[PDB]
Every structure is written in structure tokens, then in C-alpha cells.
């Protein structure tokens, strides 16, 4: 739940002393990062209907899976794929704007194995789904953020394998 | 059983089941026919082989019977003929299951310190098992009385 | 069936015929009082 | 004597001597001679079938392995990997090899060694992890063999896991999804917890 | 098949773990199925093995254990 | 409305209820030597 | 630990009756078909490495799962899933002859939930491939004998969940 | 939940065929016996409280399950054994109109065998209701639709042993 | 030898033979006259079945035979069929002894370390003993071949 | 721990032929002997204690030994006996179903000689209790059966000395 | 079949059939039942042969399905072995007729004229048949395999 | 890598990082930008790489590509390439480490039960990471190659 700044202090309340600085200096420098996060933050908001779209074409399309035989075949199961993929949309620009992957192992992480394996879910489209939407997510939101971006997308993977 | 023995012996080997284990089950279920007829044989027979082994435990050991012993009372000698029929309800389980797997785990696990507790002499039951296999050995033929008696005298020295 | 015959007249709802159910006996006897505190507020918040 | 009785007494977790009025005698004669070792006193007595059918034959394999470690080595598994390649000697060649995989390890002989009995190494008697210091006093408890679900590898596994799903207070407050009753994994009955 | 050996393994680490010592120099029967796993574990204490000599066994079969 | 991802495995991992949930059969077609071998044509009657 | 004989002998046995007429029908019944089973067993036992290469080339092999992301890219994984699924099918043919599934759910079944949840693998992958050894198995020893394996995969399918 | 035409399209939905003449004659066979099955369950429904009186009749009654010292004894306890009694004779009548077990597996086999462990009720007694309830309900109907009632109840013993 | 393993079970418990083990080593012997039958028919036709499941064995795997193989050349399919000629052997061991423990601890305990190393197929002996297998049991008699053909059964499972 | 099986086996294979005529007559020698040999194995197994039971009175008992002075004066010693006659009979049925005495070689004899001049015993009294127990188990068993009993007590008793 | 060549044998010489040749149609229509449960287990598993014994020639015989040959690729792999299927066919027609007449009037009249217009060497496809003839005689029993197999040798005797 | 086994092998004996894998690890780090531009080379000729190896192993082993071996066919062929495609992409795994724990936890630790269950030769595996080593160290320059290739050759020890 928390983030780079409710980790801070946080971690300094619980020590009994006040805001010092080396804690401040922690701050800097997620306050010198702050303003690359909120125009990454924007880019994706306006792109959340597109990113999923191309990323599904990227790996998800004409394959077993697109087809009978495959899982997301019958219409109710495709859309929900796309729907279990916008939420890794979502809460990985959530994380991105936290500087701190905590919101990752509260909402998004929990049911990951139990659910996708309940439901035949393969976890093994789904990994190869989200580096094919890290693909383009840094390609639309450039080098430097890409690479942010690229820990929470990294972090969802790793924690779903 | 014997199914059960082949197959846990054969389950710490974590292998399958030998063709030498496997015509010990095929042979068994052969010779389970035979064997069906005596459990029929031994329940019919079941009130009668109860009152007579234990008029010939009374001539031989009368220190169950008399005072200073435990069973000087008319329930308490009725205990002790129920415990010999508690035995003879085992004595027709291993014969149809082949082994003494059921003599062993529901029959002579612990009867040597329940028996030190309750005030009751080990030895003195295994004579009167003995007495209930002279007469279970004279109601059935002596092809079958060879393989039913030897289930008793597995458990006579069990007990002893 | 005091509780039933005033949803039978329309005197109340269902949702009030509901809390007029599951505040009986013999619902917190099933699902109360035999059993584990934060067992009893998850089942009755399984099934209302 | 009593050496004989203890030997028992940490193998099958109570003096079956004494209790149950049985164990091979056969054994204890070539323990009392001096012939055999109290290493191999424990080996002889781990392939018996004495031994497989109170401790092998009642359990699921991965809990077999958690529970022969408790016996013979006198303490809890440590690691998954330490987990893992015991329980690859189980689908070798059974309890047979598994008894022999261990007893021989140079864990055993570096702490018991030769002549002395096993003993379970508590807290106080040498250092204990931190890692498994939930499920290992669970283990050295009297309890340990009707714990039937298997404690290391459900949190071996758990720890490179994320939260799994639950209810948040734990597994027994989550009832059974049927029609009625409101069944739950009652705890103290079979500890699921 | 088994095989009674003599052998004396000192331990190297009582010094560190601080423990009681057993004497060893022992001799025990240890099996043929057995043996070469706890042969190795002798090598890596750099234990001295004394003397092998076969108990029982009947050296040359090919059945019977 | 809603239930546990523990407890579905409970209602629908089962044998009769699984061909609903994941793939099954798969079956394989005609082998190709086989349909190479029909004369186009499965019934005829008097022009036998 | 029960074989369907020791059970109709326990059955009989908590009552504390003798044998009764339908008890010795059920184990003449029991005596009746014990032929069939011992000639499955060495049948199933001699196939053992072939059914276990079939069933997983027919329902598990070419998807994601062998793909990197799913549970059998790793060869630690796909030999450790052998090992899972030879115990199977030894358990079963286990369970065959003693004609009781009793067997299997306290040496297979009892933890099988909770360390497939625990290490994070399918159990619906598990399931079917469980099930995809079923037909093999019933197109190996005839349909009279696998229609009577058929009773101890469902068995296990039925517990796994 | 699905039925005999509901397994058999979603049979031949997932190979993404249409309905071949391999399918047809598994419908064919149901609508056959359509007929049949539903004059087998208003036989049933007249006499629900009769297969129920009769099934007890011969297991549980005057025997010592219902002792003081018995699981049956208490008053509560029995009219939940009918009852629960009942439900496994109700949803036997739907697996039989429907011509599937799936409806079983769903509501009735749900978690059955963990609850009673659960709860301290035998489950060998249950095995011998239901084969009683089997006998009397295949004099009532007819030994015709009686066979393949017996096939939803034996289901049902099937995954209680 | 079935016996061997009764008396190591019995050891193993400290305790003397059980009368459902007796009846397993009664049926044993009272059939001994039979099993030395079942041997001199293979031994009689020992070099026919060579001759036919080296051709049944070079149709399904001619991977061997051509060259790059295991065994190419003809010195080297001679040894091909001796390795063949031990198994037909060691099965008529394996059938007098009534266990399987004469080919356990002759022929398939290392089995799969000296295949790894000697570069044939382990999966092609496991089809040699098949085709072996079936020309055999079209030999004996249906109901002597019920019990041989387990022993043939092993030889093929416990290869891969 | 070889059988008259397995010793004509592995006579054949230390030569490496098949089974030749001469190996034949050894085992249908076997054959022919091996049923009355379970049924003296039925007996000795029902008598084991009643023989030991006499065979002390013959020999062991009011002797110097039993008395104080002697050495089974002790309760641990005359207990250690009676386990170590139970152990000779045991083990010498064990020899008379193999038919040789490797079972009775690997076992029992290797620690006998040194160990009981290590711990004192009299061996030259140790020899007539059991020479004495060989004569009292051929009154109970039979005269033909009584000889191949008397060849194996004897490699106990050559054994001792 | 034999009735047929039996009639218009005695159509030319144009009298009735002699008992000597009556005999022999009593012997073949009581012998009739047994030759249809030879083809029947055929037909049943006609799928299992032709793909095994294709996968038997193309193993030992490699440069027929390699390019260049004939049957490469997968339709012409698939029609080769539909000329196989056909011959299944016609071996199981045989052996309900009791002759080798339905094969000799319809498969193998001109293959040596057919297969060197068509291009495939008629050495190799008479190799494919020896490996139907070592597949179908393996699916079934040990007496009635030698019958069947007379027609399998004609089909390779009528190319070779 | 070589920094956790230098840890692990610290951690177990209970002391501090001693100065032997203080030097270790401060040389394996200042080599550390020399081991990328091996191990990016490897990735950027990885095309090439796959398709030379892959013209050098099937002609060494024809027995695999011909039909009846396990690669026969262009979906079965394909997969063979791929099926070598995950051990040049280990390799470079193994490379940046600097040790083979990336080897041994994902390419090595259950291969042979792997291929046994897959109907592939194990050594000719063996001889195609061989091969494709022998295309490796054409790519780099001498001093590396010994350094790279030494990754390799702990590949071929782990399959024969
Ligand atoms: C008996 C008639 C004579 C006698 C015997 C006596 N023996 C012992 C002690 C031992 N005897 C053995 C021998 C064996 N143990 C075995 O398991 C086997 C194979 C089945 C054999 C041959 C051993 C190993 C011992 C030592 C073990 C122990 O003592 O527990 C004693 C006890 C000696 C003591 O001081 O403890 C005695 C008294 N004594 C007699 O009166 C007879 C001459
Ligand atoms: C990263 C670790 C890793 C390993 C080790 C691995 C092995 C692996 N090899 C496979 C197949 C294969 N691999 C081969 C390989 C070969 N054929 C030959 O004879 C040659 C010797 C050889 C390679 C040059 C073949 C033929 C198959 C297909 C097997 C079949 O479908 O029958 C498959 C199943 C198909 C699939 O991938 O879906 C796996 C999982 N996979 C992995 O992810
Ligand atoms: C005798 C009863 C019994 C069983 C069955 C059992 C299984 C068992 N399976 C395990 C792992 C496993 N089981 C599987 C199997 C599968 N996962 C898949 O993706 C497939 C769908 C499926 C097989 C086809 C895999 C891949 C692992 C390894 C997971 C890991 O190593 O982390 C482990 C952890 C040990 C290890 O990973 O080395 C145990 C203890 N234990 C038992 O005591
Ligand atoms: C179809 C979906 C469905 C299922 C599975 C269902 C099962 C079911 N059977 C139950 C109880 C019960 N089950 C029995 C069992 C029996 N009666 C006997 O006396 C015999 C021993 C045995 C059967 C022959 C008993 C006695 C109870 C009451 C237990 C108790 O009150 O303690 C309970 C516990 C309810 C309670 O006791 O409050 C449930 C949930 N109800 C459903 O709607
Ligand atoms: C029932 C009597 C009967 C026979 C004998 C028959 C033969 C027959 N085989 C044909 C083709 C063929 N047959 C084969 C067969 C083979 N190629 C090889 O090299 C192997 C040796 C061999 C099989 C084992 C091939 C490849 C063709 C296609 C010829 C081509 O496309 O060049 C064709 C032309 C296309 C067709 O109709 O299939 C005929 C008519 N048809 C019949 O109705």
C-alpha cells in the first residue's frame, strides 16, 4: 500500500526519532524522479484501450490459444482476457507512480497461481502476454521510463511464476 | 490379507509388484473358495464350541473358577467366556483373509501388559485356545483342520 | 411465521423479512454460537 | 538397557517396549554384544518392518521425509533443495534407501558419529534456524506423526511464493463451499492450519 | 552380505562445535549395500581404515542376496 | 455473487465438470489415406 | 490401510458381528474378479514408461506449458512432473488389486491439495493429464479391466480437489 | 449444471467441428430413451417419502446406530440423516432426467467426503443406505430405467468411499 | 527363489513362518513338477526363437542394423544375440526359481549404467524381450504361459 | 542366504549354461521332499515353546549352571537362553525349508564362537542342551522328517565347536 | 471362392458336381465361421496396421519417402499409403472367400505394368506388405496367424 | 554466479567474507565488462550460431533425421532446432555468471530422465553441443574462446 514516501516514513516512525537526513536525502531522490512518473503516468492513461490491443496481437493472436481447443475460444472467455490483462495495466502504473512495488503484493498478487489454476488460466500465456506489453508500453513511454516501468512489469511476471 | 502384505512390501521397495508377488495373489483367490466354506463351517458351529472348550478349561485349570482367582462370579466367568468368543470372531476373519493380518492388529498387539493390568494370567488363556482348537479341530476334516488349526497355534504362542 | 406473514401481507420487504430472519434463535444458535467469532462474521457475510 | 529403551524412544517417538509389549529382539542382541554400532542399531531398525508400518505405510512420501528427519538426523529440514534431494532417494529406492541416504550423510556422522544414540536437538542443546523455527519445536512435539498435510514444503515453497489465497485470518477460517451446514477445517482435528 | 571393518575416524570439528567425544577405533559389521557410501564418508572425515576382512557371504555368487 | 478461488476447485475440478472448464477430447480427424480411399460418394443402391 | 477384503472384514468388525451372508457375497465377489486384476497388473507394470510417454504427449506436451513462463519449461520441472505422474499410476494399479482406494488416500491423496497449491503447480494441467492416462490405459489391458481403472484415476481426480 | 445435449455440443464445440455423424447417434440415444426417463421420475416424486421409509428400513433401523451410544440418536441428527438422505435421492432424479452426473459433481459432491471426516458421521453406513436405496427404487420403476438409476447412485457411492 | 523371500520376511520380524505363507510355499511345491516343464520347452527351443526374434527384432528396429547403429556388422549382431540368448536363459531360471529375484541379481540391477555406457538402445532391448516375448508363449501352452509370459513381463518394464 | 533352488542356479551360471539334465534331478529331488517339509515346519512352529520348555528340564536344569555360582544364575541369563534356544530353533527351520545351511552360515554362526568366550558361556555345555533339543523334535515330528533335522542341529553343534 | 470356381468348373464339363468336390464346399462353408472371426479382428484394426507397417517400410527403406522418391511429401506419403490400405483391404476379402481368387481378379493382375508407369519400384512395395504380413499376424493368435499369412505370402509371391 | 557460491560456501562454515573470496570476487568483477562482450556475441550471431550446428549435427547423425528416428518430419526437425535454440540461450546465461549455477538449476539436473521419457538419444545431444561449440570458437578471438567454451564443455559432461 505504501510507496517511496510512506516507506520512508514509515520506516523512520518506527525507530521513535523524527524526519532526519539521510531519510530527507531518500526523499530527493524520489522527488527528483517524481516528475518522469506523472507524464509516464498520463501517456498510459490515454492508451490503456491500445497497449492491451496491439499486446494481444503481439503473441495472444491466431495461435492454439485464439483457437477451439485453446482457452480464451468462446467470446465470454476472450473479453475477460482482456480484462485479466487490464488489470496489469492498471495497478503496474499504480506501482509506478508508489515507487515501490507494495501495492504488487497487496491487490495483484494474490490469488495468481490458485485463481489462474482454477480456472484454466496457463500461466505460461500470460507471462509471454506481459513482456509482449512491456514491449510496447516502453516503446510508447520512452527509455528512461521504460525502464520504471520495466521493474513493475518484471516484479507481476516474476511473482506469477 | 496377503494383498495387502504384497503390496506394502512392495510399496517400501517403491516398485511394482514382482511376478512373484503376483502369483501369490493369483494363487490366493484360487484357494479362496476352500476357505469361504470354513468360515461357514466355524460360524455355524459357534454356540456349540464356545460352552464345551470351556467345560475342558475348567478341568484343567480350575484357578480361573476358584476364589483367589479372577473369575469367582457369574458375570465374571461370563466375561471370559466372551473373550474366548472375541477371539473365535478373529480366528474366522484370517482365514478368509489369508494371513493373520487380522489375528495381528485388532487380536495380539498389546495382550501382554492388558492382560498384566487387568489381574487376568496370559498363560491361562492359551490353553483355553488351545482346549477351543482340540474341538475345532474335531468338527472339521483333517485337510482343512490342518490349515485352521494352525491359525490357533500361531496365536498360542503368541500369547505365551 | 410472524416474521413470514408480514411479507405475505406486504407489510414489509424482502430485505427487511431478511434481518427478521437472521436475527432468530435459530439462526444464531446454527451460526453464532457454536462457532469461531471471525468464523461467524465470515459465514453469515457468505450468506446474506 | 536403558540405552535400548531410548533407542526405541527416538525412533518411534515412545517406548513401544514398554507400551506395546513389541519390537525385535533378534537386534538387540547384536546391539548388546557390541557387534553392530548404535549407527547401525538405528539403520537395522529403520528397514524393519516394524518401522514401515508405523511410520511409511500411514504417510504421504513427502511427509514421510519430514518425518524421518525428525528421527534420525534429530531435526528439522532446512532448505528445499535440502528437502529435494531426499526426496528423490524415496522414489529410488524407497524407505530402504531413503534410511540409507541419511543415516549415512555426513550430517549424522558429524554430530552423533558412531557409538551414541540419536538425539533431537532442541533449542539451548546447539543453535537453531531461523527459517524453519515455526514447524521444527512442531515437529519435536509428541503430535508430530498426525500431522497427515506436510509442514516444510508448504512453507518451503510458500516463502518463494507470494500471499497465497486464503481467508486473511488464516486457513481454518475458511469453510467448505456447499450448500449448507457451514462446515469448517476445524483446526485441532486434523491440523490443517 | 556384510563385511565387519576397523576403523578410526577422528572428527576435526570438536574443537569447534564443542562436543562429547567418542572413542572411536571400532568394528562393526557393516553390509555390502551399504558399505561403499559409508567407506566414502570415512575418506571424507580422513578417517584410517584398519582392516577389512568378510564376515559372511560366500565371495563369487551370482544369486542369493 | 462471488466465491473462493480454493473453493471452485471444489465444484468444477471434478471428472463429470471438467469438459466445461478446459479442453478434452481433442479429436483427431480422418487419417488422410483413409479419405483418399472413399469414391466420393458413401451410398449408392442399385448401380452397385 | 485396508484392502475391499479387510474392509468388509472392519465393516464386520465395528458392529462386532460375525459374517454375514451379503459380506461373504462381497468377497465371493471380490474372489470372483481377482484374475482379471492380476492380469491387468503385470499388463500396466510392463507399460509403465510407455503410458506415462503417451499421456503426456497426448494432453500436456506442445502448449505453453513446456514453453518458458509455464511449470514444465525447466528440466528440473519436467523430470520432477515424471516423477509426479509415475507415482500415479504405481499408486493406482496399487490400488487396482487390493480393489479398495484406500490406498491412495492416505499415501497420495492427503497433502496432494495442499503442496500442488503450495509449490504453485496446476492442478487442471495435473487433472487432465490424469485423465489423458485413463484412455490410454483402457486401450492397453481391453475395456473390462480399464473400465475398472477407470473407477481409481477418477478416484484420484476426484481427490486432488 | 450441463446435461447429455449440453456435453455433447460442448464435446464437439471445443474440437470446433460441427455435429458429425459420430455425435448425432449420442443424441439419438438420448432422445430415444427420452421418453422413458421422464415417466421414471414421476414415479419417483409419488413415492419420495416411501424410498426413503424403505431404504432405512432395511440398514439403519432397529440396529445400533441408533443406540444411545450411536451417531442417529439424537432427534436432530436423524431428521438431518433423512434429510440428508433426501438430497441425495433428489438430485439421483435430476442426473437421470438430465442423462449426466455433472449436476452430482457440482452440488452434491462438492466437499462431501471432507465434511463428514468433519463432522464424525460414518461414511460405510452411507454406502449401505444408498445400495438400499437402490433396491427399492429399481422394484418401483422398472428394471429398465432402475439400471441406469443405478448408475447416479452408485456415482454418488462412488465418491462418498 | 519364493522361499528365499519368505524366510527374509520372517527374519525381518523375528517371528516364524505364517500359515497364509506356508500355503503360498504348499502351492509352490506340489506345482515344482510343473515349472521344470515350462524350462524344457524354451531349452529344447532355444535356438528357434533366437533365429525368429533376432528377424522380429531387425524388422521394428532396423536402426541397429544399419550402419552407425549399435550393432552393425555381422561379429557384432552375433553378440547382439547372445545378449538376446542371456535373456531366454535367465527366464527359465526365473520361471523354476517361481521369483524373479534370479533375474534381478543377474540381469537388470545395473542394467540401465552398462546400456548407458555400451551405446545401444535400452528401448530396442526392451522391444528384443517383447519380441522375444511373443514367439515364445505361442510355444507353450496357454495356461503354462499365463504364468511364463510374467516373467517375460518383467524383463520388460524393469529395461525402461 | 541361498536356496537348493538357487544354489543349482547359480552352479549353472558360475558355468554360464542353461539348465542340463543334472540340474534337473536336483530340483525335482526338491520338489518331491519340499511337502512334507512345510508339514514339519506347521508343527515345530506350533511346539517352539513347548520344546524349549523340556529341553532346559532335560539338561539345564538343577545342574552347577543354574545354580548359584554358575552362570545362569542371573534372570537376564536364563531369559538370554531361552531367547538364544528360541533363535536356534528358528533359524534351523529356516535351514530346513532352504534346504542347506547358508541360511544358518550367514546368520547365526559368525558371532557365536567368539563372542560366547568373550562372554563366558559354556560352550561345552551349550552343545548337549541343543543335541538333546534335536532328539526331542523328532519324537514330535516324525522319524522321515526327523533325519534332515538332524543334519542341520548337527552344523549348529559342528559350528560351536 | 471355392463355390464359384467349383461351378463353373463343372458348368463347361456341364453335369452336376461330384461329391469329391461337394466335400470340399462342406469342408469351407463349416470352417466358415472361423475365417470371419480372422477377418473381423482385422477390420476392426485396420487403423493399427497401416500406420505401423508404413512406419516399418519408410524406416527400412528410406528413399521412397526422402525427395526426390516418390511418396515425398505429406499427400504423396498419404497416398502411399492408401496403396497399402488397399491391399489390407483385399487380404481381409481373401480370407472370407476362403481363396486367394478376389485378390488374383482384382489387385494383381498388372502391378508390373501399373508401378513402372507410375514410377515406384515394385521391389519396395512388395517390402511394405512383408511388413503388413509381420504386423496383422502379431495382433492375432498363435493358430490362426499361419492361415492368414498363406494370402499375405501370395501378395508378395504375385510382385516377386 | 561465483558470488553466491562464494557466499554460501562462507555462510555454511559461519564467518565473515574471508580475503580468498574477497579477491575472487573483486576479480571476477573487474572482469565483468570483458564476459558481456563474449556473451553478447553468442546473442548476436545466434541465428547463425543455430543453423550451422544445425548443418553439422545431421549429417553426423542421420540415423536421427531419417524416418523412424525422433526429428523426422519439418515440425519434429524444427523443434530439434529449437530444442538446441534453449541451450545457446543457457549458455549465455552461463557466461555473465560466471559459473554454471544458471547451467545446473534450469538445463542440466533432470535431462537424462527427460529424454529417456521423450524417445530422443541422449549422446547425440552430446555430439551437437559439441558441434555447435566448434562454431563458437570461430566467432571469437583466441583468448576467449578458452574462457566461453569451457561452457560448453561442462554441457557435454553433464549429458554423457
Ligand atoms: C544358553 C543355553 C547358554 C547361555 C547363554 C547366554 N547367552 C548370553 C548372551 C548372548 N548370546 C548371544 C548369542 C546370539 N545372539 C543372537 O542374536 C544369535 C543369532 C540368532 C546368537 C548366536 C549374544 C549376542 C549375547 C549377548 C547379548 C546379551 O547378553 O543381551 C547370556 C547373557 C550373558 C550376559 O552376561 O549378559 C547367557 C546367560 N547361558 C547358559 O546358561 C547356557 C550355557
Ligand atoms: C531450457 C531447458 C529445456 C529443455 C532441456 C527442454 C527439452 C524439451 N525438448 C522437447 C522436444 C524435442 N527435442 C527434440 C530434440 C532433438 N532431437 C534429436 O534427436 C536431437 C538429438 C535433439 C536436439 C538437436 C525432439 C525431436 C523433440 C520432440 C519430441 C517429441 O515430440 O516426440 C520438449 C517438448 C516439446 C515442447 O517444447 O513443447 C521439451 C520440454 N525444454 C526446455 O525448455
Ligand atoms: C506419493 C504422493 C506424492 C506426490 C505426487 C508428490 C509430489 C511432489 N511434487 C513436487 C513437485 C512438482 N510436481 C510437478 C508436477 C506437475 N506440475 C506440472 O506443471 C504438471 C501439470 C504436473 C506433472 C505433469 C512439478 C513440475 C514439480 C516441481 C516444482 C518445483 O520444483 O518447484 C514436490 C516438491 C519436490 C520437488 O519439487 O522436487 C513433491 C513433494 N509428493 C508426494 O508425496
Ligand atoms: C446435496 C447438497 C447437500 C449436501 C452434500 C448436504 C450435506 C450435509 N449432510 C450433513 C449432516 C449429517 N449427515 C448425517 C449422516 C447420516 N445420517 C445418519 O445418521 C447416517 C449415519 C448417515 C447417512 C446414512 C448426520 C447424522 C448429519 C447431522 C450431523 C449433526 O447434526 O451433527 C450436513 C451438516 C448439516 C448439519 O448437521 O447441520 C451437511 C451440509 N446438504 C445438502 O444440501
Ligand atoms: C486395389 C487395387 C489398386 C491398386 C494396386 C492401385 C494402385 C494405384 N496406386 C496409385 C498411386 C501411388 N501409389 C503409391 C505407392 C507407393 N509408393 C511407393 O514408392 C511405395 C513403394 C508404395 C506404397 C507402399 C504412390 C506414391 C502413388 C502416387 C504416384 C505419384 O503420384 O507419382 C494410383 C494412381 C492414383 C490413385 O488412384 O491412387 C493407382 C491407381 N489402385 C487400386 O485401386
Not at chain 1, 82 to 88: A, M, S, T, V
Not at chain 1, 129 to 135: D, F, G, S, W
Not at chain 2, 102 to 122: A, F, N, Q
Not at chain 4, 170 to 187: R, V
Request: proline residues 4%; positive net charge.
Amino acid at each position: 500500500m505504501q510507496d517511496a514516501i510512506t516507506s520512508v516514513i514509515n520506516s523512520s516512525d518506527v525507530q521513535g526519532k523524527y524526519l532526519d537526513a539521510s531519510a530527507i536525502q531518500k526523499l530527493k531522490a524520489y522527488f527528483a524522479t517524481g516528475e518522469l512518473r506523472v507524464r509516464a503516468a498520463t501517456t498510459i492513461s490515454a492508451n490503456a484501450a491500445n497497449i492491451v490491443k496491439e499486446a494481444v496481437a503481439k503473441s495472444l493472436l491466431y495461435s492454439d490459444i485464439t483457437r477451439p481447443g485453446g482457452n480464451m475460444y468462446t467470446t465470454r472467455r476472450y473479453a475477460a482476457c482482456i480484462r485479466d490483462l487490464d488489470y496489469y495495466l492498471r495497478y503496474a502504473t499504480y506501482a509506478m507512480l508508489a515507487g515501490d512495488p507494495s501495492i504488487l503484493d497487496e491487490r495483484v498478487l494474490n490469488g495468481l497461481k490458485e485463481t489462474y489454476n482454477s480456472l484454466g488460466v496457463p500461466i505460461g500465456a500470460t507471462v509471454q502476454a506481459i513482456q509482449a506489453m512491456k514491449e510496447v508500453t516502453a516503446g510508447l513511454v520512452g527509455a528512461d521510463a521504460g525502464k520504471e516501468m520495466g521493474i513493475y512489469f518484471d516484479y507481476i511476471c516474476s511473482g506469477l511464476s | 490379507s496377503i494383498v495387502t502384505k504384497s503390496i506394502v512390501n512392495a510399496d517400501a521397495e517403491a516398485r511394482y509388484l514382482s511376478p512373484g508377488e503376483l502369483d501369490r495373489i493369483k494363487s490366493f483367490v484360487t484357494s479362496g473358495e476352500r476357505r469361504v466354506r470354513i468360515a461357514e463351517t466355524m460360524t455355524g458351529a459357534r454356540e456349540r464350541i464356545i460352552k464345551e472348550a470351556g467345560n475342558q478349561l475348567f478341568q484343567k485349570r480350575p484357578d480361573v473358577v476358584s476364589p483367589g482367582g479372577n473369575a469367582y462370579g457369574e458375570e465374571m466367568t461370563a466375561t471370559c467366556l466372551r473373550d474366548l468368543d472375541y477371539y473365535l470372531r478373529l480366528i474366522t476373519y484370517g482365514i478368509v483373509a489369508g494371513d493373520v493380518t487380522p489375528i495381528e492388529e485388532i487380536g495380539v498387539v498389546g495382550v501382554r501388559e492388558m492382560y498384566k493390568s487387568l489381574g487376568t494370567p496370559i498363560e491361562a488363556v492359551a490353553e483355553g485356545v488351545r482346549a477351543m482348537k482340540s474341538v475345532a479341530t474335531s468338527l472339521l476334516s483333517g485337510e482343512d483342520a490342518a490349515e485352521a488349526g494352525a491359525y490357533f497355534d500361531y496365536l498360542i504362542g503368541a500369547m505365551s | 411465521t410472524v416474521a413470514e406473514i408480514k411479507l405475505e401481507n406486504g407489510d414489509i420487504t424482502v430485505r427487511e423479512f431478511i434481518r427478521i430472519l437472521a436475527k432468530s434463535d435459530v439462526f444464531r444458535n446454527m451460526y453464532w454460537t457454536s462457532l469461531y467469532v471471525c468464523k461467524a462474521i465470515e459465514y453469515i457475510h457468505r450468506r446474506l | 538397557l536403558d540405552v535400548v529403551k531410548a533407542a526405541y524412544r527416538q525412533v518411534f517417538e515412545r517406548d513401544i517396549t514398554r507400551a506395546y509389549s513389541q519390537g525385535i529382539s533378534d537386534l538387540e542382541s547384536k546391539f548388546k554384544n557390541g557387534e553392530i554400532s548404535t549407527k547401525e542399531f538405528i539403520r537395522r531398525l529403520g528397514k524393519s518392518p516394524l518401522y514401515r508400518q508405523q511410520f511409511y505405510s500411514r504417510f504421504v512420501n513427502s511427509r514421510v521425509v519430514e518425518l524421518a528427519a525428525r528421527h534420525f538426523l534429530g531435526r528439522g529440514l532446512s532448505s528445499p533443495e535440502e528437502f529435494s534431494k531426499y526426496f528423490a532417494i524415496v522414489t529410488k529406492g524407497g524407505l530402504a534407501a531413503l534410511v540409507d541416504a541419511m543415516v549415512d550423510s555426513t550430517e549424522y556422522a558429524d554430530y552423533f558419529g558412531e557409538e551414541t544414540v540419536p538425539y533431537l536437538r532442541g533449542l539451548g542443546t546447539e543453535a537453531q534456524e531461523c527459517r524453519n523455527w515455526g514447524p521444527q519445536i512442531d515437529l519435536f512435539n509428541y503430535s508430530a506423526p498426525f500431522r497427515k498435510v506436510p509442514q516444510f514444503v508448504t512453507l518451503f515453497g510458500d516463502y518463494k511464493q507470494p500471499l497465497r489465497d486464503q481467508h486473511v485470518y488464516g486457513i481454518g477460517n475458511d469453510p467448505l463451499e456447499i450448500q449448507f451446514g457451514a462446515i469448517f477445517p476445524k483446526e485441532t482435528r486434523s491440523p490443517k492450519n | 552380505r556384510s563385511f565387519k571393518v576397523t576403523a578410526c575416524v577422528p572428527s576435526q570439528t570438536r574443537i569447534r562445535t564443542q562436543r562429547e567425544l567418542q572413542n572411536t577405533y571400532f568394528t562393526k559389521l557393516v553390509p555390502y549395500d551399504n558399505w561403499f557410501r559409508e567407506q566414502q564418508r570415512i575418506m571424507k572425515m580422513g578417517g584410517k581404515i584398519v582392516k577389512v576382512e568378510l564376515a559372511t557371504g560366500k565371495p563369487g555368487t551370482n544369486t542369493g542376496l | 455473487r462471488y466465491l473462493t478461488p480454493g473453493g471452485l476447485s471444489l465444484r468444477s475440478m471434478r471428472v463429470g465438470t471438467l469438459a466445461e472448464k478446459m479442453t478434452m477430447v481433442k479429436d483427431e480427424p480422418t487419417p488422410r489415406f483413409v479419405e483418399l480411399g472413399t469414391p466420393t460418394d458413401q451410398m449408392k443402391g442399385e448401380l452397385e
